[PDB]
Ligand binder design. Sequence first.
Ligand SMILES: Cn1nncc1-c1cnn([C@H](CCOC(F)F)c2ccc(-c3c(-n4cc(Cl)nn4)ccc(Cl)c3F)c[n+]2[O-])c1
Length: 236
Amino acid sequence: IVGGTASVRGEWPWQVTLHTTSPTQRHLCGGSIIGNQWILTAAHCFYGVESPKILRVYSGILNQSEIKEDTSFFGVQEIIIHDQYKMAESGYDIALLKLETTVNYTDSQRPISLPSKGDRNVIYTDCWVTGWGYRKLRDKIQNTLQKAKIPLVTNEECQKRYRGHKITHKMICAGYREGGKDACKGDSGGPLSCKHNEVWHLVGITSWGEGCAQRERPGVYTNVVEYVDWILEKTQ
Ligand SMILES: Cn1nncc1-c1cnn([C@H](CCOC(F)F)c2ccc(-c3c(-n4cc(Cl)nn4)ccc(Cl)c3F)c[n+]2[O-])c1
């Protein structure tokens, strides 16, 4: 997260850190708890992941430095990638992780609601991106989870900024005209969380962008409301 600030414990309890364990253990992507056995993340996270066997899902984590050889994690039973996914920039960048067992929800591990049936025309004005990613283009994975409030932009404007890409109704963009706040390397797969009527909704999945927080180059997110039928079909 560029232009952001550190979070405190329990502030984003649906945020997870997905680690790979090959060839060495490291943060791979963010993700979001949406059910006791289900994480929603980006499909591009699994490029070159040989199988679910090498994945570890850590919930309840503020600082990456909390993760030690005895820290409890969830195994991944299945990675479910959207059938039409090819690469992040061309859409369908969404994946479900089915965990091996059920998350018992606690103060630090909670689900976030999907965008609701009948809220497709809501204008979200309180949206936040969170993650352990870079604070600049040439940086490092951060120890402490970062947060940044970012405004949504219209799909018309977003397409104008990315005339070499197909910005469809299945994407949503977010960023300041002048730049300065955005996701960056290591934030992908995590949530774009928006609060409406004091309830948090998973509006986007962090997907791709041109550089980090550049002027007139918003971050591009998978538009989760357009995938709710797909999620419900896979989680039942
Ligand atoms: C894990 N890690 N550890 N050290 C490095 C990494 C690492 C490296 N790239 N990434 C991912 C892709 C691969 O993900 C996983 F497979 F590695 C990635 C790709 C794109 C974005 C992104 C960007 N944007 C553009 C530029 Cl340039 N930089 N960022 C801008 C806006 C939005 Cl909205 C975005 F989403 C974020 N991320 O995270 C993780």
